[PDB]
């Protein structure tokens, strides 16, 4: 009470934060591109600015947690925290982060196939695993790993973003049981997350297997995880029946198919990530090493 938590409300002052562009919607919120131009000279750093879409009390609390999580992370493959802007005369909050010009990896794979080959896909895979290794050291569970939530700086660098669903493991447990769920990205979820609301490093590994699938499908029409799972389940199914059939399919070894042109060895990594036995899934350290060895074992 006596002394409020340390904040730097003069680091990004609203009057100097200039709108450049609307970018998109990250889990609970909206993101814009702005320029921070304190020397009112039409220059300054270009930044991404996340704001809430519905500024309820509960959402503001969740947003504070997301901000504290991101501020605690510093890694080449994690989107950079820059600060907070307390706008509306210090009666609102916005998160200031670095801006990555190529947007989401999901969009980049679709818009920039001219510059993507398997080498690049494996580089992105490696980078994602290394970011995730780093999150694990902090006991953070991302809970929404998907190509839509990975951002592209340039042809040789991607970074994990969207920490809006991230949870911190309890001190004494290796899983977090989410007792509030929102809308869930079910087609990226591990079976124990679907059936028990349990999230862990190992369920992030499951979702990483889906990301690896996404990369090798090159975000092709009809090959997305939702499209393929719905084809397997029955495209006419609606509502909870979808979830019931997804659970049953996964529990009895139904899996996304090997993408066209995907090496068997990469599909094997996917299928090892998609182990119903939580403890048998590889670690992110295992995966980064394996992917880098595959890359390094190529000629040259
Ligand atoms: C060509 C198809 S397009 O015309 O439809 N199109 C594609 C490119 N694009 C775009 C989106 C984001 C970014 N950069 C970015 N940087 C950092 C963050 C961050 N720190 O969260 C972020 N978050 C947002 C992802 C929520 N977004 C750059 C470009 C929107 C318009």
Numbering used by the authors: 833 to 1132
How is this structure described in the published paper?
Janus kinase (JAK) family of nonreceptor tyrosine kinases consists of JAK1–3 and TYK2 (tyrosine kinase 2) that serve as triggering kinases for cellular signaling of over 50 cytokines and hormones in regulation of blood and immune cells and metabolism. JAK2 activity is crucial for hematopoietic signaling particularly in homomeric myeloid, and hormone receptors and activating mutations of JAK2 have been identified in multiple malignancies, most notably Philadelphia chromosome-negative myeloproliferative neoplasms (MPNs), where mutated JAK2 drives the disease manifestations. MPNs are clonal neoplastic diseases initiated in the bone marrow from a mutated hematopoietic stem cell. All of these compounds are type-I inhibitors that target the conserved active conformation of the adenosine 5′-triphosphate (ATP)-binding pocket of the kinase domain and show variable target selectivity and differences in clinical profiles. Structural analysis showed that all compounds anchor to the ATP-pocket of the kinase domain of JAK2 by making two or three hydrogen bonds with the hinge region.
Cerdulatinib and lestaurtinib displayed potent inhibition of all JAK family members. Binding of these pan-JAK inhibitors stabilizes a closed G-loop structure, where Asn859 from the G-loop and Asp994 from the DFG motif are within hydrogen-bonding distance. Cerdulatinib makes three hydrogen bonds to the hinge region: two to main chain carbonyl oxygens of Glu930 and Leu932 and one to main chain amide of Leu932. Cerdulatinib also engages in a water-mediated hydrogen bond with Asp994. The binding of momelotinib, ilginatinib, cerdulatinib, and lestaurtinib is mainly driven by enthalpy. The exceptions to this are cerdulatinib, which has an amide in this position, allowing more rotational freedom, and gandotinib, which has a methyl group at the same position. Compared to a similar G-loop structure in JAK2–cerdulatinib complex structure, no interaction with the tip of the G-loop and αC-helix is found. Most inhibitors did not show significant binding to pseudokinase domains, except for cerdulatinib, AT-9283 and pacritinib, which demonstrated one- or two-digit nanomolar affinities for the pseudokinase domains of JAK1 (cerdulatinib, AT-9283) and/or TYK2 (cerdulatinib, AT-9283 and pacritinib).
